[PDB]
Amino acid sequence: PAGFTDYKVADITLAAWGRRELIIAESEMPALMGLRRKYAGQQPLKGAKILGCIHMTIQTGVLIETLVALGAEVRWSSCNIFSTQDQAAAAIAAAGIPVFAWKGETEEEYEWCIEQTILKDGQPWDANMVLDDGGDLTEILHKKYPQMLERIHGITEETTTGVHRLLDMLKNGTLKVPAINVNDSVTKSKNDNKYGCRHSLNDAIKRGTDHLLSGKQALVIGYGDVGKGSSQSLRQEGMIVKVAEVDPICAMQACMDGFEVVSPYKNGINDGTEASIDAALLGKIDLIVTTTGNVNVCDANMLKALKKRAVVCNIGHFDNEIDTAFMRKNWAWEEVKPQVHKIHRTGKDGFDAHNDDYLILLAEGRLVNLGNATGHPSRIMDGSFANQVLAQIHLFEQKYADLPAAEKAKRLSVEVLPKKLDEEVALEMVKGFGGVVTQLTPKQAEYIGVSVEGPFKPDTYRY
Amino acid sequence: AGFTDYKVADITLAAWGRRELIIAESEMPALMGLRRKYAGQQPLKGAKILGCIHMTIQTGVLIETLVALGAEVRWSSCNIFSTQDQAAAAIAAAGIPVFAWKGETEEEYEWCIEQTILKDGQPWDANMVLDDGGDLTEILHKKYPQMLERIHGITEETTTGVHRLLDMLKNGTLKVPAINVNDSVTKSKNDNKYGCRHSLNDAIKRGTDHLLSGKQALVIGYGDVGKGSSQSLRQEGMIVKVAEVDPICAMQACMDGFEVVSPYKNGINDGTEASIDAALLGKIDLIVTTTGNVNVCDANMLKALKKRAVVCNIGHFDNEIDTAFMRKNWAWEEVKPQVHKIHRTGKDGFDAHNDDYLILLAEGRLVNLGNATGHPSRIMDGSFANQVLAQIHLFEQKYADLPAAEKAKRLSVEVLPKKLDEEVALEMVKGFGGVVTQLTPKQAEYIGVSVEGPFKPDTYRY
Amino acid sequence: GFTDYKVADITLAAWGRRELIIAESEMPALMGLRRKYAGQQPLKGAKILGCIHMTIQTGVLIETLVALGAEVRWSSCNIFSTQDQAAAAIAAAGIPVFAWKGETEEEYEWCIEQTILKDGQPWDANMVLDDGGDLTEILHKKYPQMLERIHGITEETTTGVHRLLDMLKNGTLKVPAINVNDSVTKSKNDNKYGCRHSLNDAIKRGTDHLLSGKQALVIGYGDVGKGSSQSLRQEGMIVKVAEVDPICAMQACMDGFEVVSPYKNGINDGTEASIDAALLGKIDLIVTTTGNVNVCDANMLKALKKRAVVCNIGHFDNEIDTAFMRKNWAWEEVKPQVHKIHRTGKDGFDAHNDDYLILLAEGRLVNLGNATGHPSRIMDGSFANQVLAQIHLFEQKYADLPAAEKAKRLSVEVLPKKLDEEVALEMVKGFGGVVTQLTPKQAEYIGVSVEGPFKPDTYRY
Amino acid sequence: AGFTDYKVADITLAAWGRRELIIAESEMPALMGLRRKYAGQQPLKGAKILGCIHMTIQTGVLIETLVALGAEVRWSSCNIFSTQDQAAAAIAAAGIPVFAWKGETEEEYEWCIEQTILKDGQPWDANMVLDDGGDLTEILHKKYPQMLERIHGITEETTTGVHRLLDMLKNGTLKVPAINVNDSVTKSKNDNKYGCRHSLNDAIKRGTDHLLSGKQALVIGYGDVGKGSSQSLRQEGMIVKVAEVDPICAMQACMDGFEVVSPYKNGINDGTEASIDAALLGKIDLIVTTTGNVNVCDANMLKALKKRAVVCNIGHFDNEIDTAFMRKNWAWEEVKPQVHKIHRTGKDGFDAHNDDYLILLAEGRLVNLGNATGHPSRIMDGSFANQVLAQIHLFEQKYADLPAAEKAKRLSVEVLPKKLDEEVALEMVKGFGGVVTQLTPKQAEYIGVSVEGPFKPDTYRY
Ligand SMILES: NC(=O)c1ccc[n+]([C@@H]2O[C@H](COP(=O)([O-])OP(=O)(O)OC[C@H]3O[C@@H](n4cnc5c(N)ncnc54)[C@H](O)[C@@H]3O)[C@@H](O)[C@H]2O)c1
Ligand SMILES: NC(=O)c1ccc[n+]([C@@H]2O[C@H](COP(=O)([O-])OP(=O)(O)OC[C@H]3O[C@@H](n4cnc5c(N)ncnc54)[C@H](O)[C@@H]3O)[C@@H](O)[C@H]2O)c1
Ligand SMILES: NC(=O)c1ccc[n+]([C@@H]2O[C@H](COP(=O)([O-])OP(=O)(O)OC[C@H]3O[C@@H](n4cnc5c(N)ncnc54)[C@H](O)[C@@H]3O)[C@@H](O)[C@H]2O)c1
Ligand SMILES: NC(=O)c1ccc[n+]([C@@H]2O[C@H](COP(=O)([O-])OP(=O)(O)OC[C@H]3O[C@@H](n4cnc5c(N)ncnc54)[C@H](O)[C@@H]3O)[C@@H](O)[C@H]2O)c1
Ligand SMILES: Nc1ncnc2[nH]cnc12
Ligand SMILES: Nc1ncnc2[nH]cnc12
Ligand SMILES: [K+]
Ligand SMILES: [K+]
Ligand SMILES: [K+]
Ligand SMILES: [K+]
């Protein structure tokens, strides 16, 4: 529109291209678009003012415009420095939506962008809803703008790491507003986290290095939802995949799924010494992928022992899964192309351009699927963002900020969406594939003790 | 010396069974680690356990583990076709009352169960129940409620059995507390899924020796058993289509690379032949039911199936397939035990060279156990370690010695704590030679767990 | 009163007949050959010496040959591969057959002799069907005069073809032969997909071991090694592959397998020191697939992880040094064709000894020894090639040719690709597949007839 | 600097290309092993090679291996979309004449091949040819047959080019001997299959970022490229159907777990819309042509495909798909380079929010090279080690200098000896850390081979 400058993107001329890709993505997101069409007439989010912090991809564009189509105002930023698709951010800004995001931000630019959503015209925006991915915006609000939380009705957190931070604040009494855990919807956790990484991990590695994967040796650290999806991403390409875990139930699943379970440390004991590193094992690894959400699971001693020219990447939320700090202090970095670096283990000052003793680090340790590719595909993010919309509507309509203190105390929690809504999202996803769900006969529904409409499983069911 | 309190097919198979039990013990490290750890403590001394579960080699290692920990048992199988006779023989030969053989009649099945409940014509002084499917539990509540006054708890193996317990509980008709063994992760996401992955194609190959690559399969259900069964067939190279009523499970099937379809047009089962997607069913070479529901492969579906298609059921009960319709209308030709050609040409007789027949396996009973040996020992290790832990817990709680006011406060259906689930998993991983990494204190602090676990909140779905 | 046979138990015939009727519905290419050649009786006057695993599938092959006019006399080419109900049904039909499951070496030799001799004198045989070359060898060495009446040999398997080619090179082969093995609808169907189906099948029936999560070493990656490797990997085994052929080793790499050697740096010097004891100490299962000699040797057997399974799916048992195990280690029979080999010695064994290996079928081909071999729908391809090869060599009548015309025909050849394609189409139709027909322009564009053959003879598929 | 005998998109991308060249060298052990082995001998001293093959990073390593062995070259790409611009830049910057860029026109493509043939308006004194698809070979035979008098041979990369050579050989129009590089096992059974397995789903993801799991694909053809393409999609969770005209290849698709279908009712392509299986084609989300044939995805098939289906080709030439019909009848909307929405609602104009469109990748050109980067270095290593050995053998044979009677005995289309195929394979295996076992003397004697090989008869199909 004419006069709109309340944004900061890399190249506004990319908007036409981004619009072409948003129009394709709408065709790939039936659950999310079905909610857009379902709630359009009602406008369940009229009056919502949403602070959003999540990877500014084409898929997030569809989510953003869905929220706007339901009545909300939003101010947006990405939750990672390398995850933004610049044509997505351009198309959103061209639509008149405040978005501060580009691919390749510095740490300072990243913090600047979140603050640009928090502040409008040099004063705290009168926001009343928060959509977060990783909890960085939630942390800035609680630590730097706590008075704004007196007007916010709730937070809808996208990812595992963010939910852990919320539960930590709830346990310490420091969480100021209720939240919905979007991550643990089955149409999110067991779809986004697992199948998303199956699609996008080997995608990112091929775009970054164009390395053949078949026949090579991989070590996946972690076998949660992301580790499961990451392991399959590599194994389906023909890699020989070994899996590390601290959780023996997950380790049991890796074994039964056909993976050898190993540890980087002798007998799994990480005493911090070089002698504890299984140097024979790590000397045969061509690719190491961290998937834990933990800290320093690919440490300095492991990086020193890795086979020459191995690829190192992280698909967990934060870069501290790999001890990149050590590599910056001790090893020379040679940039191949954006988000692909050769780390030369021959010393800090300078490198031989034909040196063979280097490692290849992708996205400088940041989420590799979004950093070196485009993250999850639209048809997978459909489930996650459908949940986001439902979670926004529910928390906004509850109107926590307006309740009396006694009613607040009953509502101050971290909850998940009801299974029935989970099932309804899954149903639209299945129809997108052309799948046909069978309806129970009344006699059958009575036999197993469920309604014909569902829910079909008890809340304890793990799928 | 003069042990006669048993009924098996052939006691002379005992030596063979002992040889296979010794092998199975090396495949079951978690169960044997329990046997080693608790042998001296004798935590089941005084326990008198009525056991009703498939009398396989694997159940034999379970039985002898309970006996090793101090228990007395009386045992029957929970399916007429699932017993391995050499395993029943080795257990009888060791002086353990067992009433089980492959190929029981329905009457013999009920009689075997009663032989565990009655000793010398009187009710045995049982105080513990181990059940698989809830048949023994039902007979106890229905025909012997006085025995339940002395029983400290039930440990239920399987999905169908847990559902029947939860129905009794909401109806106020459950008399003793139960432990839901099924919903240990080292049971449900191990036994139910991976076990059927191993044993479904196994049983189909033993029954028919049919090539599976390139042929078309329809799996009804995509719960844990349906997941495992679908993989059992897809890894053989079948083109597998999946049916579901649960849209979340259907979503998983699509993402796992399967076409999700319905036997009925637009998914609507109106009971008429016109509802049958006859085009789809006419292309199916193999159908497998996995639901725990009733009549999910109904008469109209059986009428529409491709000639010479194979029909089998791997859920707990045979009413998933309308076998009664087939007994009533079609002529049965036995190829060999637990393999029948069912001739759709009529009831009275059949032409030996008729081409319009179906092949039914295990007369619609659990096919992995009926036509093969069920799950392998190293998978049943997880399930049966959980059973031993469940039996110790309920026996040590001594529910039946509580006043009526306290019984009411502890009458429930619970699962084992996650810490025990993890410890069973550790011994399973070690059995494969896997090495679990230990968290550093700062790593445990960072994700908010103890170094030793539990590593996941109770909400985690794995 | 037919008595010209010997089987385990003739009362199994009705059961075998029931399974033959099912097998026919799984073998459309073979049954199609019955319908196509029935009226013409192209093997009328043929008298076939047959030596191949007496399975239900072989039963349908036998009766297909008879339906086309032939008389046969049958034995099995392995001591453990007979299905007794199949042999029973063949006998009951009035067909001379000498085969049962669990023959001794002596009885095996006696069974071949019974097919060769009728009433104490050599049968007037004129055709040979063989699987592995044992019948071929006995005729060439013990009854060379019968070969003057025989029009040809149709040899099933890689080991047999290799023996034939040595005799051809050495000028000792008497009659022409058809390499049935190297039809694509045989080698790239039977040897590969067949073992994919039947290797894990046999391991499950013998041991009921979980395979998922365990470590396997497959020795060899030819057609059998390729299918065997896939049989285990699809169950979830972590499979390592050994090879002497770098091209085959390259395929294993690209297929997602780690390529390893039992010997350090791949050099086998015959000493325990050459053994990669750390590799072997992790292996839960080893399978030999080479057709070579002693590829699972004594030093490898000493070094295997306790309680590993050892088995062979090549044609002969000498792939595994079972001789060494019979000499030094105590054998405990678990059940027929399943033995625990106690590495503690030969002076008895502790029934609870933990240091043993499990050997299947005493090293004989394990898919047939501990299960039922390949499924009917796979053997359909192989045995359609066998019938066509029988007709091709029989209609040529080499034994009646003038001497000055025999040299042109004394060879070992494969069937023409047109026959290979004809068998393949019938298999594809068995699966409900629909083959696209080229338009004339498309056929012109790629330079083939619309009728085929569709590939040059150089093509490898 | 001073040197202007090239044309690339952007010479300033050279340092980037050089960085990726250095990485590729570490991924190409067989190609670099020939570089080291023959560097001292200079076996291509005097060779002047015209090269026409996709100007990628992998081709760069091939080009610099030839130069390192003493050759001079003049290079162009064999496809308008397959060049990597940073690779062409690094080559031109190394002083090597190269005429290639991503996104040429058909005129510029021909012009590039002409600029290698001609130096300063006159024909270069070439004596060797390296070709991929036969376009350069065709241009020499038709338009510069005088240059062939002094050329010692052709090394053809791909199946389509070998076919064109064998036609010329049969007709007697082939002027110089050729080596079929394609049919080395370390080429056909590595490049053609495994390469497409890697790069087909890679290209589609880069073009569309479409989820592939759970969607329906139809692969036209099941040769080596079809086999790899089918696996590329199946391994991602697609439901893959396979079409074929060759029953043997069709039998392989069945046994590999694929449903084999024809786009035509009963497989009869009579040229009418009635012959189209509209039901089948209405369910397909992605079609991929792999045939090397013409019009195997015709106009009626395109009219019948599901809305928003993806259409691409990974055969050598774009005429596998009838893109001519689409240019004449439908409106093309460019999403981004090499990605077009083809709106089936008319020829002139389109609604930006129209839903009846197909997505065509690379305008029908080879999708793996057009929308991604083709095969990975470690795979092209095998193909390009064969190319070097092939060039060495034909250049040293010096055909163009041989007596007429010798010319006649050597004018053929031949493959490399199996011993060299094995030697290439061995270096690829060592590149993976694989360990090849050495036969003992007795074992080699038992199977009738040298301990050094070759290990298989020439008839072996692997
Ligand atoms: N990049 C993406 O597209 C994407 C998508 C979803 C989530 N995520 C992020 O990925 C991370 C993992 O998420 P998740 O859903 O898989 O969580 P999860 O809890 O399901 O899995 C993490 C696993 O790591 C294991 N682990 C922890 N410390 C370990 C160590 N030192 N060594 C080995 N294993 C260890 C734990 O046992 C656990 O099973 C989170 O930070 C989440 O926010 C990323
Ligand atoms: N044979 C074995 O070894 C074995 C092992 C474990 C459990 N079981 C039995 O198998 C059954 C299933 O066990 P589970 O743990 O997988 O249960 P589950 O609840 O996880 O799965 C059953 C599935 O069937 C689906 N379903 C229900 N009705 C349906 C219908 N009409 N059509 C299609 N799908 C339908 C449900 O939505 C559900 O996902 C139970 O009877 C259980 O006792 C057998
Ligand atoms: N059991 C069955 O159902 C069945 C079916 C077909 C063939 N076979 C038999 O299996 C054997 C193999 O047949 P094939 O078609 O695979 O032959 P093949 O030539 O295609 O493969 C054998 C492979 O073994 C490799 N090899 C040889 N010695 C080796 C060693 N010491 N270490 C490692 N690798 C070694 C060779 O390089 C070759 O690639 C033959 O004896 C054949 O008759 C058995
Ligand atoms: N893009 C790449 O990276 C790449 C790599 C190698 C080869 N190629 C090219 O791909 C093409 C195929 O090469 P190839 O080695 O697989 O050849 P191939 O001969 O091995 O395979 C082609 C197959 O197509 C089948 N076919 C022909 N017409 C058909 C039709 N109308 N319908 C269905 N199937 C039909 C044939 O029967 C044959 O099996 C050639 O043009 C080749 O140059 C591309
Ligand atoms: N494409 C994507 N868009 C937004 N959030 C994501 N998380 C993972 N992939 C994503
Ligand atoms: N082998 C087995 N033994 C006992 N119960 C089982 N359930 C499934 N397989 C079993
Ligand atoms: K994306
Ligand atoms: K079992
Ligand atoms: K069989
Ligand atoms: K590349």
Side-chain angles (χ1 to χ4, degrees), chain D residues 19-87:
Chain D
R19 292 195 295 274
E20 296 193 338
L21 278 169
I22 285 168
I23 292 170
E25 296 166 358
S26 73
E27 286 284 302
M28 304 176 88
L31 198 49
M32 298 299 283
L34 299 178
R35 230 189 250 190
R36 290 190 306 273
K37 175 175 188 175
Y38 289 105
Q41 173 177 112
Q42 289 295 281
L44 297 181
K45 181 51 57 205
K48 292 180 192 275
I49 309 165
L50 294 175
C52 183
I53 181 175
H54 316 290
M55 191 52 254
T56 63
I57 295 279
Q58 295 68 51
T59 291
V61 181
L62 163 66
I63 290 179
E64 285 192 327
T65 304
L66 300 169
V67 177
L69 297 194
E72 301 172 49
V73 301
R74 298 180 73 77
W75 222 265
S76 74
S77 184
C78 65
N79 189 268
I80 60 172
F81 292 146
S82 56
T83 291
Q84 304 184 254
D85 285 335
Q86 75 273 20

Side-chain angles (χ1 to χ4, degrees), chain D residues 89-90 103 113-114 118 152 189 192 211 238 251 256 258 261 298 300 328 334-335 346 351 357 386 396-397 441:
Chain D
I113 302 175
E114 300 275 42
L118 298 178
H152 304 288
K189 219 123 314 95
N192 297 32
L211 173 68
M238 295 198 86
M251 174 274 303
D256 297 341
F258 298 113
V261 303
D298 62 25
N300 293 329
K328 217 277 289 288
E334 172 163 332
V335 179
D351 183 16
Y357 63 86
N386 286 282
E396 292 179 344
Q397 188 185 236

